[PDB]
Swiss-Prot record:
Monomer. Its main location: secreted. SMART domains: LYZ1. It comes from Gallus gallus. This is Lysozyme C. Belongs to the glycosyl hydrolase 22 family. Lysozyme C is capable of both hydrolysis and transglycosylation; it also shows a slight esterase activity. It acts rapidly on both peptide-substituted and unsubstituted peptidoglycan, and slowly on chitin oligosaccharides. In the egg white and polymorphonuclear leukocytes. The active site is at 35, 52. Pfam families: Lys. GO terms for biological process: cell wall macromolecule catabolic process; defense response to bacterium; defense response to Gram-negative bacterium; defense response to Gram-positive bacterium; killing of cells of another organism. The keyword Signal applies. It catalyses: Hydrolysis of (1->4)-beta-linkages between N-acetylmuramic acid and N-acetyl-D-glucosamine residues in a peptidoglycan and between N-acetyl-D-glucosamine residues in chitodextrins. Residues 1-129 form the C-type lysozyme domain.
Length: 129
């Protein structure tokens, strides 16, 4: 599923991400826009053989099992395919563990390079939340 901006903001809000660990909702919308273009089916392979999955491009080296990333951990305890669903629940729950790990949203390279320090509230302007 390809979400619209406001539709995704509302789904994220309902799943408890607005101000989760101090990150306002617009941070999470901005990250999803530049990680996946709001497409739950996005996959991208990394140089190390790991793969990133879903709307938040969660990486198979630490966070999920895809059966092809040798010596990887599965810290969210889920198959990586569950992250590609039209229901963002699994992605959201895993993201909450990632952002709690110590580096906050810096774990998402596109957040750090494209969202961090910008006016992220613009990502939720116009939305009925
Ligand atoms: Cl915001
Ligand atoms: Cl893994
Ligand atoms: Cl933080």
């Amino acid at each position: 599923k390809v979400f619209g901006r406001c539709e995704l903001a509302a789904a994220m809000k309902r799943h408890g991400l607005d101000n989760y660990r101090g990150y306002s909702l617009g941070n999470w919308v901005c990250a999803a826009k530049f990680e996946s273009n709001f497409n739950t089916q996005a996959t991208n392979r990394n140089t190390d053989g790991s793969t990133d999955y879903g709307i938040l491009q969660i990486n198979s080296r630490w966070w999920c099992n895809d059966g092809r990333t040798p010596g990887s951990r599965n810290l969210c305890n889920i198959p990586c395919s569950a992250l590609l669903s039209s229901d963002i629940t699994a992605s959201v729950n895993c993201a909450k563990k990632i952002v709690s790990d110590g580096n906050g949203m810096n774990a998402w390279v596109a957040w750090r390079n494209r969202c961090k320090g910008t006016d992220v509230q613009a990502w939720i302007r116009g939305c009925r939340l």
